[PDB]
Design a protein around this ligand. Structure first.
Ligand SMILES: [Ca+2]
Ligand SMILES: [Ca+2]
Lengths: 896, 823
């Protein structure tokens, strides 16, 4: 009674309390989960010594154990004016050698919109950050337009270079000197060019700079200050001054080599380079199906303090920083298999580092199961500000390839290191990175000269249509030519990648620039051939190219819907057997109506009863496909049977309403009597009208269509039609009798006109959304279309197609897409408009495979600037984002 | 026996608490516990800066003749190539001055040491001093260093003059600058140098606040520096049409036509609130929230952006969980640019339009109108200004606002420029403000700052690294003691002994009141030697000396034995709470005196004592418990040798005796009144001095503290000790032999010191009592402590004031002994 109530209340009380407890718990779990969340590395790019211009090239170098160290290039400074190995020499450099980039003056100024004036005072550090970041983003398969105006963070390890001090020597200070040389402007320019609004900073902690930026980026992402982050470092060797300071401070090896862990370690070698990585919180990278290269688990940064010299390393400081980083990501020391050491190859540094590693991993590691150590420094030198980014990248590649690369110069193990009491092993050979199921974890160390130490822990990453359309584009013809070349080498080197996947990635994950190319292909070999054909200039079907003018807009597009005489057996069968947007429309029709499908596509006809509603559906199905790919008509029109589908598209009817009407007239005109003929006459509408008058046949013969200025279709009684044709032939006027059933748009259509006006009366008429050109008028349809009168008058009146075309031409239309099984209206269309005017595109065409016609037309719309829904175009297929070529920068020399 | 609902509501209460606690620490206010600066207008302290701001002083001046020749770079023509638009700027009074020895920088190292590094060291040192951080708590600690700093021209002018040196690196690299702060201050937490242009100082703050909230560090140094070393930058900025030809930031005025370059340095000390309160630190203000962002691609690279500024202010408010309505003041980025000023006010209006009214408006101003655009250090000046505004509960005027800018829709923007020094009137509610800084290249920052929550005998210790600095330090205390008579000497002493580094040149002053201290310091500056004033220059790297504790025996006792210490000193009371009475009584008093000396950081290197004194030296050594230790015929004094008296005992055949050997001509004879009286009469007949009052004839664990035996007279049973003589003279010679020079006597009378001086060479050693009958118990103890401090003994000054209500007060900062270094 009321006992039910006190018990109902008690259940509802608990119910609420459990709901509140669940939600409170969830709220706190989210906070904890977020705080220790791995940060997915989703893209990387670099410029390192030894001609390294990508992670693939860095890995080959690392894999093959190549010494990238060379003599100071004559073009940087004359090493002959500074080299002196004598430790007592004043104002001299200890070494002849360094780790240098292949070029530093080269930059694609127009790509980034930097005027040639501005580039003269632009720090080569900024030039490299722009190229590298762009590529890091491309490689992460993000589109900079969809990245534009976003909450993305920029965290760069960057110090001032000597560029400005080389300008101050020759010229008078200019306004660009500031933006061109400030490290704050360097990072600022990335946010400016890529349109990034998140946190932005330039850090400088010497050798740990690159790793401090990572820590800060990971802080930002966990704290939800951004959703994407660029993290990197730069370091350039522009003047010998810094090399004199480092030689005088006794930091540099007279051998010009980092002989890390070797008995002969006697300082480091100065290298230069640039590395940028793209970061997301792991959950966001899993949600977006990004390829995770590796994950950053934990980071720590600390200081040596008063414990020892300002420029001398400190073992307890290094121990605290590794331990804090392991603590920050919840990694146990036992989980770690590899360390990419700071390993600068100094006499006192090597023992302090290995000793600090021995302190951290001593209880977790054994001499039989040791920790592996090594450094990129033995290949490319010490990149100082950019060391750490190079270290991280090496570790990431090692994780990708499941191999540990060899560390160079390790001949005599250092006697000052107690090898027998430290479970440490120097990687001397390229070896499989073995594990026992256990996920591969590594550490990267960077110990700054002024005592600012940093450490990072990185774990291994977790765990139909047979005709294709490829789009390529660059900001310049030269750049597109270089891009096409990239693809030819790319396709020859990676034949294991699916053309479906390559195409999908290029269309969806790459920028659509003004110098474009569209290629239709069914297999990799065909694609390869067509790219070669285009390069040689061999004008071949399925390959379209154009340079759109700068700041150009998508043109207006006219949709022309086909008429009665267009049908054939199995028309667009392939799209039914292969295209879901088309099928969800063609089957939806079939439900309204033997079956539409058995008539259209039999197991194994031209009669108006079938003929009329079929085309409507087929055209609605084709229109459903085109809008799915992002095509939206600016005006519509159709030859009688096609004005039905043109009207449903603009709103006038529902698929059901419109398809009921077309099935009605089809069934109606079929039961109508014989003796009905239609003739195609090559003569003006006036010439035919004067002959109708002359022969007194005006009440027995009608003009069915005006399709051209000298191309008209006559309709009426068999004898009368034959009489006018015979007379027209007598006048040398060409005539063609149509394989028609009944005399359409002729007086003979009067009996049915009431039984069909009955059907039209039982229909709701909604106003049109898109512009429609009337068949009855040859002008823009007004409010006239609303009343079922317009549709009854439609059967009786001649089809003014010629005027419909001139209307479109007067409105400035030059792009026409035919939605139908044959390019009929295109042929008639080309005849109405002046020669060579407009672009005419079919949907279906006999002799051309359905997908082949649809894609050749799509590529041609993409040449006009029509924004294609490329996501939409590959939605119903099993596509995966793959690695594809990055942008081919058109480099030019800027200095002085 | 709980129902499902009861259990759930219990589990729910806990879950809610766990969530509230976590959410609280994530948005925890960060306390500002000290600041220092060097700003234009001779500003060298937050106090001098507040006078500049208070009195609406304009600190702009022409470029100093010793910086660069302005006449060679100035051209009025705004079409002039390679010239400076103005001849003015906000300059520092001196930039070449630095106390290199204080910092341990050689003169060769200082020649190439970037002035930015010089200011950073001085400024950080003062910030920590003002925050009253205990030296031992700062050295070898998890403290972060977050500084806004970009490279200066210093090395460019070095390169024109010499061959590159090793020092050029560490003397000019911005990482080296922040690195050195950690090196000198002994800091092990995160360290970084940020460069985001005009927003660097605010970005460094945000980073520091994050680090503190993330528990990466427990204290942090945050700030920035900017210096105008060469004309080159001023040329670039003039060519870029950024600089006012008037040489003034006419913020919000109609004539606004650019900014004026300034220079300066600011460092602030940060702590999470819960820690600042727990440690009783003086909270100047709290940092509620911070946010850093970018313009992106919206406007031009060097042009500001309103929407970016709206996003950043809103983020800083959200981050701190602050309602826009709570904000009463904004320290505007306001650089005085033509397009910048409308954008800025527009953006303020957008964030605060629906919360502020024309009747009740938001107040805006900028320190740039007083000192110029300090650029990298711009954010630190703005913050310091707002902090000073919250402290003094007033809004300082903003200069050059004559004609309100017609491009600003003042009639719709509920924004008001501060024109006069006004009382910061809040309607009961807490005072909250925000500081904006928008970097020239788009990096924006905004910070939200809120008002801060809510025995009579003394020993002052003063110290400096040099004699000149200690006099300068004493001089500053003299001036300070006059200007603030409102300050209790107890608190002044407390702060100076606990919150200041103890250096080589030192001074100890015992005084009972403010008047006594002022006078004694005046007497010291004259050289008028008076009791209770100690002074010494301890040598460079001189360790704490060996202290030998001496405990008295029978005879020293009196009726009012340490009564002043029994009542006023609680450590003495704790330990406390005729031969049958006096023997454990002297032990009782010597235990209480020792415990009290030990609570001041005193620990002996050796222990010993006369008769009862040996038993008390034993408990101290740890040879037996206090519980175990305490639980347990005429004598004549002879003025003759131990040998000279023993030969007479054989001659008179009186053998069956010497009680104690207190010297080579001072011995004690024990025996029967007839036997001893016969010696005394014979010894007086031989012309040997003799006197006497004793009502009788006298004479577990291992030791952790070295002990000199009375029996052996050397290092080291209790039954034999009673029989055998007390070899005091032998015990003193071994102390002398083992290099002992510092002697502390624990007892009621300084008996053993007089006895000890007679056993050692002329003027050798320092002799210290505990109690002296004529002298007051506090006076004798404090004068002895002052002498232990002079010797180098690490005194536990916090234990010295542990039982008295002592509060940290604003005390003076180090007088840097400046010298000129350049090239
Ligand atoms: Ca160090
Ligand atoms: Ca901007």
């Amino acid at each position: 009674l009321k006992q039910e109530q006190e018990k109902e209340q008690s259940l509802s009380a608990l119910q609420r309390a459990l709901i509140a407890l669940k939600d409170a718990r969830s709220k706190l779990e989210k906070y904890e989960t977020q705080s220790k969340e791995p940060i997915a590395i989703i893209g990387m790019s670099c410029r390192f010594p030894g001609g390294v211009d990508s992670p693939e090239s860095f890995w080959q170098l690392l894999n093959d154990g190549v010494d990238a160290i060379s003599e100071v290039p004559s073009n940087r400074w004359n090493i002959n004016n500074y080299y002196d190995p004598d430790p007592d020499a004043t104002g001299k450099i200890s070494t002849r050698d360094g780790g240098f980039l292949s070029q530093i003056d080269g930059f694609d100024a127009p790509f980034f919109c930097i005027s040639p004036r501005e580039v003269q005072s632009l720090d080569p550090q900024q030039r490299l950050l722009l190229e590298v970041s762009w590529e890091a983003i491309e490689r992460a398969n993000i589109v900079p337009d969809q990245l534009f105006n976003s909450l993305t963070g920029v965290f760069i390890g960057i110090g001032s270079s000597d560029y400005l001090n080389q300008l101050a020597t020759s010229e008078v200070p200019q306004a660009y000197w500031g933006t061109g040389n400030a490290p704050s402007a360097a990072t600022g320019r990335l946010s400016y060019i890529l349109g990034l609004t998140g946190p932005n900073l330039a850090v400088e902690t010497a050798c740990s700079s690159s790793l401090v930026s990572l820590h800060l980026a990971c802080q930002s992402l966990r704290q939800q200050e951004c959703n994407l982050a660029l993290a990197g470092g730069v370091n350039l060797l522009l003047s010998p001054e810094t090399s004199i300071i480092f030689s005088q401070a006794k930091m540099l090896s007279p051998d010009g080599r980092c002989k890390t862990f070797d008995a002969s370690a006697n300082g480091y070698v100065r290298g230069e380079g640039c590395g940028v990585i793209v970061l997301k919180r792991l959950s966001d990278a899993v949600a977006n199906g990004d390829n995770v290269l590796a994950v950053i688990r934990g980071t720590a940064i600390n200081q040596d303090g008063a414990s020892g010299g300002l420029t001398v390393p400190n073992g307890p400081s290094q121990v605290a920083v590794i331990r804090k980083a392991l603590s920050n990501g919840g990694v146990d020391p036992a989980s770690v298999s590899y360390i990419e050491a700071h390993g600068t190859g100094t006499s006192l540094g090597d023992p302090i580092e290995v000793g600090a590693i021995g302190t951290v991993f001593g209880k977790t590691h054994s001499q039989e199961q040791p920790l592996i150590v090594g450094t990129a420094k033995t290949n490319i030198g010490h990149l100082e500000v950019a060391a750490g980014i190079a270290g991280l990248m090496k570790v990431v590649l090692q994780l990708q390839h499941q191999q540990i690369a060899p560390s160079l110069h390790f001949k005599q193990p250092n006697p000052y290191i107690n090898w027998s009491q430290l479970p440490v092993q120097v990687s001397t050979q390229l070896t499989p990175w073995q594990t026992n199921g256990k996920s591969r974890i590594a550490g990267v160390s960077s110990f700054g000269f002024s005592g600012t130490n940093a450490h990072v822990v990185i774990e291994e990453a977790p765990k139909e249509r047979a005709v294709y359309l490829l789009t390529l584009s660059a900001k310049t013809q030269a750049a597109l030519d270089d891009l096409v070349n990239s693809y030819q080498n790319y396709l020859k080197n990676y034949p294991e990648l699916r053309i479906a996947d390559i195409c999908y990635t290029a269309n969806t994950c790459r920028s659509h620039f003004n110098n474009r190319l569209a290629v239709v292909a069914s297999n990799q070999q065909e694609l390869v051939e067509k790219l070669r054909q285009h390069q040689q200039g061999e004008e071949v079907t399925g390959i379209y190219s154009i340079e759109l003018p700068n700041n150009s807009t998508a043109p207006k597009i006219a949709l022309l819907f086909t008429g009665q005489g267009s049908q054939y057996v199995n028309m667009g069968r392939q799209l039914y057997q292969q295209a879901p947007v088309f099928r969800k429309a063609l089957e939806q029709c079939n439900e309204i109506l033997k079956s539409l499908l058995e008539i259209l596509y039999p197991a194994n006809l031209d009669q108006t009863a079938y003929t009329q509603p079929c085309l409507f559906a087929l055209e609605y199905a084709l229109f459903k496909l085109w809008q799915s790919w992002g095509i939206q008509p600016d005006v519509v029109m159709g030859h009688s049977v096609g004005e039905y589908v043109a009207a449903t598209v603009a709103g006038v009817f529902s698929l059901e309403e419109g398809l009921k009407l077309i099935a009605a007239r089809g069934r109606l005109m079929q039961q109508l009597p014989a003796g009905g003929e239609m003739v195609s006459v090559i003569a003006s509408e006036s010439k035919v009208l004067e002959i109708f008058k002359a022969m007194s046949l005006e009440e027995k013969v009608a003009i069915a269509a005006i399709n051209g200025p000298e191309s008209t279709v006559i309709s009426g009684e068999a004898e009368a039609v034959g009489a006018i044709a015979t007379h027209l032939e007598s006048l040398s006027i060409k005539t063609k009798q149509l394989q028609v059933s009944h005399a359409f748009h002729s007086r003979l259509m009067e009996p049915m006109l009431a039984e069909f006006e009955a059907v039209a009366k039982q229909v709701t008429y909604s106003q049109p959304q898109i512009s429609l050109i009337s068949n009855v008028t040859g002008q823009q349809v007004g409010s006239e279309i609303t009343s079922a009168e317009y549709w009854v008058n439609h059967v009786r009146q001649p089809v003014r197609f010629s005027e419909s075309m001139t209307t479109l031409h007067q409105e400035g239309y030059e792009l026409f897409l035919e939605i139908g099984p044959k390019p009929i209206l295109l042929g008639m269309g080309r005849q109405c408009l002046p020669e060579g005017v407009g672009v005419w595109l079919p949907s279906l065409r006999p002799g051309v495979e359905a997908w082949q016609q649809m894609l050749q037309s799509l590529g041609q719309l993409y040449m006009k600037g029509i924004k294609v829904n490329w996501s939409g175009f590959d939605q119903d297929y099993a596509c995966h984002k793959v690695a594809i070529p990055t942008y081919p920068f058109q480099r030019e020399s800027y200095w002085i």
